[PDB]
């Protein structure tokens, strides 16, 4: 099984300037309890763009995708590959634009924050990946931040 | 496929003044018969603490790492970065706390022999890694070595 | 006694950039008969959002939520918490869609106006709660104002 | 009208560890038929173990007691008193071995599902309160459930 999981403004922005451009506790809390005892995947910028107090993150085997030839990733295993990437039975990609596109042929599940800002797409910002009609989904009920954002999950699937 | 093979102290001690602080030869055998006519992966530093009667470990293709380039180990491979030294199918890393730690990422096998005995750590000790919830294990039964230590064998193992 | 009171599009947007997107004097005119001389409660970006030349909101205990520990609203009651604002016997929860959303189970009472314009949800936009059926409503009949957009009252309550 | 509704083994067991210990969607079905669009009452506890996605119940006034006026229940109204929480005409009050006892007093209806499994009652499980003959009582017939659960629902009412 190879999941996504990612957290995105309703435009679809995942990621701008290096980082992720809200503040989510809750999402926070939702990612680490779907990833923690698993393998987890990213693309080296967003191992990059990972807190150095997390970098890496604990109780999960990072795993950083990377097309540069001895790239050093401390605590993480470096691969260059998507086929080196995702042999774990339990995946859950976790990490890029660049790698949620990539990866998403191969995937199974999506776990899906989606944040009720306004931020419309700017060049060169990171995008959700767009889910076709082989996907189908569940919709959870819209919520707020205990500090104002209004959020909700999808958890979608296809066999 | 990357293992790694190591024996503790209850506390988490594998070094310390250069030097494995007990005797088991008991140990020595497990650790023979899992790494023979396999690759084995080492820190420089394991390399010198070798018995120089062992060094190189007969029967298995040593490779030592070492971040000093011009390194001379005699009959082993040296090599300067962690994806130089992974690269067999079968790997045993067996050697050194910093390589432990390092090498740990890559890995979805480990060996454990843990000894009874009380040491507690110090400030510069060479220490075994924790294994997370990422690892699934088999625990050994207790018994006696040739004298009277008491010690356990343990197998982990994550896909 | 918490009611709650707003005027939204159909589509329930109650304020986009601070404001809200249409002018009703007729609404502002229900709106002061309903309040005046009671408690009302609002959240400090609805605060930020009256005009100078009511803030505070005259012949009102204006009660302004924040979770700045030193907010300043001068002519309001600044309190830290729902609990602590709602603690009068007749109150009056008036916008912010935030707030709205966190008082509506405290609430027994809604007056609503509906403003007959297409005006579709915007990413960030405050939106007006959804009324469930533990409440019962009364639908008032349809008018234009002097402007020239259809606006009409409901009155839902519930014990 | 206040009305308890729970489920409990034959033993008289409703909870133990924070969690109902079995598994029926048929009575997930029986107490959503009762207890939608109404208000609902239940101790602190009970709304802790409420599964994040229904946390608040959806279509139902949700009403939480806690001794804490500091208590944080976001979609529910949180009250510090049996007076505060029992004012609806209709109340169903659904959780917790200490709120069913301190509330029986004010009920005339109970609605309970019995589930036949072995249970036996352990120290700190919640359980069911016992009615008295002040009550009067039909019951249905035993029906399997679609997992294979053997249960039955009573009605029990007195004016
Ligand atoms: N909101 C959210 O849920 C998340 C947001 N983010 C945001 O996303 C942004 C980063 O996304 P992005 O910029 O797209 O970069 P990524 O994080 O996707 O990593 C991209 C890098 O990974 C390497 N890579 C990608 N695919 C492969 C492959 N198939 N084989 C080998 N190497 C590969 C590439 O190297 P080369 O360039 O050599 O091809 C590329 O440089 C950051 O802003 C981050 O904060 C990050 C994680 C989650
Ligand atoms: N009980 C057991 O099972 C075992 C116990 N031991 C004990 O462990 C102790 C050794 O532990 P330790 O001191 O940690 O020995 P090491 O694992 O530290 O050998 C370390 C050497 O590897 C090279 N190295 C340094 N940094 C890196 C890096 N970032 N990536 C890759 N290679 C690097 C360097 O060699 P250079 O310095 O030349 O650059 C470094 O000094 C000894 O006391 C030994 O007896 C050893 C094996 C097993
Ligand atoms: N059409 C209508 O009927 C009305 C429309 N509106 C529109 O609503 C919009 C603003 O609504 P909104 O953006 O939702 O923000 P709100 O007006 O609901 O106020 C939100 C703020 O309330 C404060 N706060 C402190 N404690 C709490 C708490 N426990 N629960 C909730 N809020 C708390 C925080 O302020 P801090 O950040 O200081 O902690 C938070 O940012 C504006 O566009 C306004 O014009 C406004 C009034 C009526
Ligand atoms: N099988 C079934 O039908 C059901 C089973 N359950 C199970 O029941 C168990 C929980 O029941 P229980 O442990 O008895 O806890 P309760 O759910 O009864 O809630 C107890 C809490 O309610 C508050 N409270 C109680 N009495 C008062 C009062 N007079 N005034 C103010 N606040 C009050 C306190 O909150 P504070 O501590 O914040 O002061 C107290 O800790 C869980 O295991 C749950 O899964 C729950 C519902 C239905
Ligand atoms: C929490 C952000 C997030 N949410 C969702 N739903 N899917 C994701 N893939 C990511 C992600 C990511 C990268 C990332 C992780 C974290 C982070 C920090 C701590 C923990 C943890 O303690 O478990 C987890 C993630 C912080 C920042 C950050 O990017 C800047
Ligand atoms: C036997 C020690 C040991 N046990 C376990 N379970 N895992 C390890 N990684 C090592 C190790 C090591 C390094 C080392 C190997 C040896 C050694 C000696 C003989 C043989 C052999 O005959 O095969 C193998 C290793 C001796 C000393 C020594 O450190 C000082
Ligand atoms: C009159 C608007 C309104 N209608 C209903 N039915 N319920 C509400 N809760 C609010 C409200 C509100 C807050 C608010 C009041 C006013 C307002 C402004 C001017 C005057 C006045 O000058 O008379 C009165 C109210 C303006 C903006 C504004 O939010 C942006
Ligand atoms: C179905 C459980 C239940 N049965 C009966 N006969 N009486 C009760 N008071 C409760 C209860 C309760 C709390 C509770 C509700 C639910 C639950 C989930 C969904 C719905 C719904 O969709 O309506 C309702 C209750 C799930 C777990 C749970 O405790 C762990």
Request: charged content about 25%.
């Amino acid at each position: 099984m190879v999941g996504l999981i990612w957290a995105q403004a309703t435009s679809g922005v995942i990621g701008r300037g290096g980082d992720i451009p809200w503040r989510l506790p809750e999402d926070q809390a939702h990612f680490r309890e779907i990833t923690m005892g698993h393998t987890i995947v990213m693309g080296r910028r967003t191992w990059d763009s990972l807190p150095a107090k997390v970098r890496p993150l604990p109780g999960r085997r990072n795993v950083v995708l990377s097309r540069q030839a001895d790239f050093m990733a401390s605590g993480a295993e470096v691969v260059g590959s998507l086929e080196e990437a995702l042999t774990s039975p339990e995946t859950w990609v976790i990490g890029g634009g660049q790698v949620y596109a990539l990866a998403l042929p191969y995937a199974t599940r999506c776990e899906v924050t989606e944040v009720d800002i306004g931020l419309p797409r700017e060049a060169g910002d990171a995008l959700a990946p767009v889910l076709d009609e082989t996907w189908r989904g569940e919709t959870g009920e819209w919520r707020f931040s205990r500090s104002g954002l209004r959020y909700r999950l999808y958890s979608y699937h296809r066999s």
